[PDB]
Amino acid sequence: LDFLRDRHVRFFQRCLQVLPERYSSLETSRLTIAFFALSGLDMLDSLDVVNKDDIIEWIYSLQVLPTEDRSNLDRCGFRGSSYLGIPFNPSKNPGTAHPYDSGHIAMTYTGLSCLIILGDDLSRVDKEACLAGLRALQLEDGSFCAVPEGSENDMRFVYCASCICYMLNNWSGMDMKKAISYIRRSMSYDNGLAQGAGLESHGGSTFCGIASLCLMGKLEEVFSEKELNRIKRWCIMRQQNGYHGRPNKPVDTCYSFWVGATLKLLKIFQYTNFEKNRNYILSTQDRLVGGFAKWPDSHPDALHAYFGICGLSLMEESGICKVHPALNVSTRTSERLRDLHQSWKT
Amino acid sequence: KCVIL
Amino acid sequence: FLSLDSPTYVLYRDRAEWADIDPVPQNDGPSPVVQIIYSEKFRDVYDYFRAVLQRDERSERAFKLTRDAIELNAANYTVWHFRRVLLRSLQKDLQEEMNYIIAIIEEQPKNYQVWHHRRVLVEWLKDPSQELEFIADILNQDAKNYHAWQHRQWVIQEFRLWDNELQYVDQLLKEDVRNNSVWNQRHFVISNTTGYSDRAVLEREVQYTLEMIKLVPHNESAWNYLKGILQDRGLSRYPNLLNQLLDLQPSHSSPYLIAFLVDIYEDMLENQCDNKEDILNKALELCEILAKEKDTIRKEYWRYIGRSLQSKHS
Ligand SMILES: CC(C)=CCC/C(C)=C/CC/C(C)=C/CCN(C)CCOP(=O)(O)OP(=O)(O)O
Ligand SMILES: [Zn+2]
């Protein structure tokens, strides 16, 4: 049908306000929910409907700053929320030592990303601390963990690391050569990229891999033309109407971005079928509450609302800003980020 | 739902 | 011990054993963002979890508290980490924890934290004896669960349990020849055992795949496997493959087959073959067949491939 723009604006506004007891499982990643909402409003050019200053303070209260004795550097970055009970402190005083308080790579990523979207200049971000924290998360094989205490490691976090380094315009946060090696090793026999070596290639990991390389500005250098052609073939084969994440799996709205954005970075999204993709995405639109779902006649959520919108953006939907396919922010925001980086170099 | 974390 | 939905459940704020602890509340400051509303019971468990966490109390009561915190939110990675700290400090029976996590995962098979927890346990115990069967059960409710397959590959590689996997793969492919995860497992097993350099193995595999393709010709997974194990050797180096596929075209045609042929023809052009301009024309003919009638949704893609072939071989 048609794109219910205002309905989605309200949907995102609601997400920023209060969530029902049944979303408790997102408690530790509330910052990524905020990102979906803010970046989503940004994409719809409606950031005006929120108080950028309040949200900026909230985000800064999530930053894990180094302590007086700088003994917790390997644990700096951003928290997903205040679930640990640390007193509200919008990156003012130093860090109040806590046995289990550390950052989470996906939160440091969405956190910085949110700050940039809200117009903040990142002056209150302890860049060196975050980078030190990032470095500590990388494993021998080049991939990353999410927290210093330990977690699973895969392509998802390689992408987070890349985004962080890119936004802080400093790649000392990772051993790029090893990360690139991990990305190459994840390529499957079917030519898509998997979460790790030997695993089933997947639209999500293929996006994370390709986008990371583009952020590093090494796509061409890492993959040969023949290789890129094979990857392109795998990616464009994901379109059924909407896109699925793996061969023989049902389509899901969010892949219109994961795969679509990858195709965009590979310069062949232009050859996909726009109409069927757009029609599928809209068929998952919740005309009553707003937002999008993974499947039609299914309940909407912040993740699919945001990616469905970004998916539409890839085809320049009337009313939606163009999304930067590798950074996962509006081109406008990526532009402001360029000015920011430039401004720093003085 | 799609749990990515 | 005391279940969260038991008639006699008592808030921690009313338990004598917890009187000495001061609960620590969560505070999102003056203007909270994406704030989740919590029931009295929920907030009560976590207000005490924060207290115990903040003091790094390695107690038996804290251990029991994590069980509740986990029931309320199994996705809280910090809770799982602390529980692991406690498992060590209190030297708890890990075989018992295995039963616990086994039940937790069955109820939440798509949670990252629970699979990570089980992996740490198996590493601690250096015992993979229950793994393959447990995973097979999970794969029974969802044969494509990415977490399950990832865990299965880790177990097999870490403890070298390759002996029966190829047979397991054969069984699952019979249940659903379209399961892309199983085809990936097959390649995982083979390339990590015999490898594909043994012409006898390659032949067995190519023949096996063609048999599967004949059963269900429209299966991207089967075709991707076939092309995957041959693309690096050089598709044009197998003259009988080209004609066997051309023979299938009559009845068993599908966009995957046409695409394969196009890829064969391209390899030939890439290797200065004989009748170059003739081969190129055979390819272009197929590219258009795909665009115009066999894989129309990718119409612009196939034509883009065609233009690429012409400007590269003329
Ligand atoms: C916050 C943010 C924007 C993070 C970007 C970095 C990440 C975490 C990317 C994740 C990409 C992705 C879609 C990974 C796959 C996640 N799964 C759902 C894995 C396994 O579950 P299945 O239900 O089997 O998945 P599916 O059937 O959808 O392939
Ligand atoms: Zn999805």
XYZ file of C-alpha atoms in Angstrom, chain A residues 15-28 30-31 33-34 37-38 54-55 58 61 79-88 98-100 102-104 107 147 149-154 156 188-191 193-202 205 229-230 232-234 236-242 244 246-250 266-268 270-273 276, chain C residues 24-39 42 46 49-50 52-56 58 72-73 75-79 81-82 84-85 112-113 116 119 142 144-146 149-150 153 157 177-185 187-188 218-222 224-229 231-232 256 259-260 262-263 266 295-302 304-305 307:
180
model
C 9.727 3.330 21.998
C 11.775 6.166 23.469
C 9.203 6.708 26.205
C 8.157 3.518 27.975
C 8.273 -0.182 27.146
C 5.898 -2.898 28.511
C 7.106 -5.383 31.146
C 7.344 -7.922 28.333
C 10.427 -6.283 26.824
C 12.511 -6.926 29.930
C 14.757 -9.250 27.923
C 16.078 -6.149 26.152
C 17.054 -4.470 29.410
C 20.800 -4.867 28.862
C 18.204 -0.702 25.796
C 20.781 1.545 24.158
C 16.624 0.054 21.148
C 17.176 3.791 21.581
C 14.285 4.723 17.522
C 16.531 7.763 17.195
C 17.929 14.846 27.832
C 18.756 11.809 25.729
C 21.190 9.652 29.490
C 25.466 8.282 31.980
C 26.810 0.071 29.048
C 23.553 -1.040 27.467
C 21.578 0.442 30.366
C 21.743 1.199 34.086
C 20.843 -2.350 35.170
C 23.916 -2.546 37.449
C 22.668 0.123 39.819
C 25.511 2.588 39.350
C 24.399 6.117 40.338
C 23.356 8.351 37.439
C 32.566 -1.654 40.445
C 33.616 -5.352 40.256
C 31.435 -6.102 37.238
C 32.302 -2.739 31.905
C 31.254 -1.739 28.416
C 29.662 -3.871 25.719
C 26.562 -0.563 23.138
C 32.670 -7.795 26.881
C 34.529 -10.771 31.035
C 34.050 -13.027 28.030
C 31.360 -13.899 25.501
C 30.882 -15.574 22.146
C 32.898 -14.055 19.281
C 31.865 -13.594 15.667
C 28.660 -9.191 14.496
C 31.890 -20.131 2.545
C 32.067 -22.522 -0.388
C 28.804 -20.968 -1.580
C 30.555 -17.593 -1.580
C 30.121 -14.804 4.394
C 29.376 -16.728 7.607
C 29.641 -15.733 11.275
C 32.964 -17.530 11.307
C 35.070 -20.054 9.397
C 33.172 -23.180 8.375
C 29.745 -21.882 9.400
C 26.745 -21.431 7.061
C 27.027 -18.160 5.102
C 24.375 -15.691 6.229
C 27.319 -11.838 8.642
C 31.497 -11.332 -8.354
C 30.831 -14.560 -6.471
C 27.497 -10.456 -5.460
C 25.897 -13.541 -6.970
C 25.250 -15.015 -3.527
C 21.463 -11.040 -5.167
C 20.174 -14.611 -5.007
C 18.697 -13.742 -1.598
C 15.777 -11.854 -3.162
C 12.556 -13.887 -3.386
C 10.263 -10.808 -3.293
C 11.556 -9.429 -0.034
C 15.755 -13.920 3.274
C 19.962 -17.857 3.927
C 19.097 -20.089 0.967
C 15.786 -21.923 1.423
C 14.655 -19.785 4.380
C 11.546 -17.549 4.445
C 28.775 -3.855 -3.981
C 27.133 -1.431 -6.425
C 24.483 -3.797 -7.797
C 20.323 -1.072 -8.665
C 19.800 -4.352 -10.516
C 17.422 -5.839 -7.955
C 13.643 -5.770 -8.305
C 8.533 -6.675 -5.148
C 20.334 -1.386 45.176
C 17.785 0.314 42.880
C 18.304 1.102 39.216
C 18.210 4.792 38.349
C 17.887 6.181 34.824
C 18.176 9.799 35.920
C 15.671 12.680 35.477
C 14.422 11.745 31.986
C 14.567 7.978 31.336
C 14.747 6.673 27.764
C 13.318 3.330 26.581
C 12.443 2.551 30.183
C 10.907 -0.869 30.766
C 8.224 -1.132 33.444
C 8.879 -3.869 35.992
C 6.539 -5.780 38.283
C 10.819 -8.514 39.083
C 17.013 -7.477 40.629
C 20.931 -9.022 42.515
C 22.526 -5.579 42.155
C 25.030 -8.958 45.751
C 26.819 -8.093 42.484
C 28.085 -4.770 43.790
C 29.629 -6.510 46.783
C 30.862 -9.462 44.755
C 30.396 -15.287 46.588
C 13.158 -13.376 34.896
C 15.658 -12.536 32.128
C 19.406 -12.594 28.270
C 21.232 -10.733 31.062
C 24.825 -11.765 30.274
C 26.131 -10.223 33.489
C 23.940 -12.555 35.532
C 28.910 -14.373 34.159
C 28.373 -13.902 37.892
C 29.904 -18.765 36.492
C 32.074 -16.938 39.023
C 23.099 -16.181 22.836
C 23.973 -16.209 26.539
C 27.788 -19.479 25.482
C 30.116 -24.027 25.819
C 14.399 -26.256 14.494
C 18.155 -24.556 10.974
C 18.911 -23.067 14.384
C 22.175 -21.210 13.738
C 24.886 -25.742 14.260
C 27.577 -23.385 15.539
C 30.782 -27.544 14.786
C 36.277 -29.713 15.996
C 17.129 -32.022 1.077
C 16.481 -28.266 1.078
C 18.034 -27.577 4.484
C 20.941 -25.277 3.594
C 22.453 -25.819 7.055
C 22.908 -29.543 6.473
C 24.616 -29.014 3.120
C 26.996 -26.671 4.909
C 27.643 -29.326 7.549
C 31.104 -29.611 3.392
C 32.349 -28.944 6.923
C 14.851 -26.627 -7.757
C 17.188 -26.512 -4.748
C 19.733 -23.698 -4.512
C 21.582 -25.461 -1.679
C 22.387 -28.571 -3.718
C 25.654 -24.213 -4.479
C 27.409 -27.255 -3.037
C 28.102 -28.722 -6.484
C 29.539 -25.426 -7.730
C 31.329 -24.872 -4.454
C 33.413 -28.032 -4.561
C 34.693 -23.739 -8.806
C 38.266 -23.523 -7.550
C 20.182 -22.781 -10.958
C 23.255 -20.225 -14.038
C 25.683 -23.106 -13.595
C 26.673 -19.691 -17.665
C 29.396 -20.048 -15.047
C 32.554 -18.120 -18.378
C 14.819 -15.865 -13.240
C 12.908 -12.693 -14.143
C 13.142 -11.168 -10.673
C 16.873 -10.791 -11.398
C 16.213 -9.614 -14.972
C 18.386 -6.516 -14.626
C 21.119 -8.544 -12.928
C 21.398 -11.179 -15.639
C 24.164 -6.800 -16.337
C 26.096 -10.085 -16.312
C 26.950 -6.877 -20.747
